[PDB]
Amino acid sequence: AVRLYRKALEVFPEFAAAHSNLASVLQQQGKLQEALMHYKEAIRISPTFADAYSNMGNTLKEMQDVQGALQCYTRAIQINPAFADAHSNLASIHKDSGNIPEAIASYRTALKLKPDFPDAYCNLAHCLQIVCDWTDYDERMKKLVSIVADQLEKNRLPSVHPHHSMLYPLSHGFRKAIAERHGNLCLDKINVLHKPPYEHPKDLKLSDGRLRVGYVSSDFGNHPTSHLMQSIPGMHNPDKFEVFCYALSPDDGTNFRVKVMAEANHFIDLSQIPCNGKAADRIHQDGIHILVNMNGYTKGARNELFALRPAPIQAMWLGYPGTSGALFMDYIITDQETSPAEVAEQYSEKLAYMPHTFFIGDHANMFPHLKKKAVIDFKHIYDNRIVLNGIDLKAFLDSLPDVKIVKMNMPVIPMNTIAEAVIEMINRGQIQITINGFSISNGLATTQINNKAATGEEVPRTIIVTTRSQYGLPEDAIVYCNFNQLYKIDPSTLQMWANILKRVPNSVLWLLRFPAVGEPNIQQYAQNMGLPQNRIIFSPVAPKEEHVRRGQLADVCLDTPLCNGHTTGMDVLWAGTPMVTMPGETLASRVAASQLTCLGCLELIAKNRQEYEDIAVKLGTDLEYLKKVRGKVWKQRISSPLFNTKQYTMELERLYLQMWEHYAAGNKPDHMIK
């Protein structure tokens, strides 16, 4: 194809269509710079060649030249205002840039021009999901399902991304099939390297009896992945394991990256090795026994590495809440609550069970200042109106007279001169004050005091004050929260929440501007459900530490059934906040119930929507019961396995050895569910 094309150019250099076709093929091959040369020839030969501009824009996009891509799409549309593809491509630039209203407008233009346009319709559907625009929602869902069905039948890559497929009422069969098609994109890409299969280790002799485990991630740095597992590499037992971390991203300068680089036995920066064949060779050279895929179909993934099968056992872990659908992945690390044996068919991988939950979080290490708290009695005694946290909080409390200890142990500071000064700082919006030599910080001002503490890179070194007044929350009412991105909400979920709010007069729902353009849509739908504006309170997204800390102000978290809080679920639990959940069928919809089961709070898991409402309302109205459940969460976040990274790592190690012994005995992968 390429050698034939080049000959056609050696024969006839002024062949615009040919240049543009040769560029496209080169693009597919990953030879982006070479492709650029030919697109440029095409547009010189014919200044009105809109298709070439559009395709050139695609190439620039892949080269990470977003502004250049936008310029190309813009020229294409100027040359041909009715060019539907170019409008859709422009919309994608707007989308990826975070400008959803502009994306929506451009996709709508694309669909006006070409009503049968799966990529544009499905991308528009995701935009609408992001901002909670549920206009014609039921019909939209039906159309998405119909589009996927048609594309699968016709052997075309589906327009619904596998990560997004969790959000739509697709069958498990369809969801797995979408994932499988993406798996195949990877196989096709590496097939062209014509690399032979790798010879894999058959024992642990060359590694001195240690199992060599490779963790592959684009998220070793400031990203949820590291916020969950950054302690795990350093907790592996060096007598039995040798840990290799393979980074798909450059060093972002954060302490998260520092920690993993310092604690892994080996750290390899594959961001410096763009070729998947060479990168796979490097992994194979290291002698990895179990290679762990921490991306799945998420940003930064290089699943081509796994398609090349450099290791004898390859497992999905933690980073992607779904199946890879890919034959080159052997196992998915999960648990009996998240992925009961009954639904093994939803997954291409064999199930490998951790004993409690597969979920983990680094909160005990990142946010140890939240292990204990004190309150200020600004009047009964509340545990979530005015809260103090700090490594040195006990010493501060010991410097005060008349501190009362409330038992069920929560220290309570009485309304005195000290308490007034703390409250005045908050009311005045002051950054910090000093009391008895101790540093007392306004929890809204962490970035001005220590920006590394604000992001979770360092433990705060001051005592922090958190109050309902900082966020405009009522002092005399129940606060239900949900701190997820708004895309996780659907009409049925908001209706449930409205039903709860109507049954609990003295209550509000606390949501985030995530993004802010979703706020007006949620508010309109709430109003249509008969809830006045003041029943729902919005706050901005906050730095990581403030986000986890402020969860202490809520009474109850109402989890999203469509796709649960994952990281976000761990965050809320660490603050001691009960979370009500309704597990569904997909992995993404069952994570919160798995977290709660490990924690030991079965009473917070609902079997259906009526039970979810009833549980939420009981917590909001039976105040002794609320005190009991909050007490249970507060204690069990410490005593349960949920946040115990050492225990988790040890259980992971047991699982790895089971996988290895199974392979070493000559067996192909099978479920590890006992």
């Binding site: 949820p224 901005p540 730095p543 994952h566």
Partner: peptide, 14 residues
């Protein structure tokens, strides 16, 4: 967060 950045889980390009 406004004035900073809050990384989240998101899909890869296709």
């Amino acid at each position: 967060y406004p004035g900073g950045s809050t990384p989240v889980s998101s899909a890869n390009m296709m």
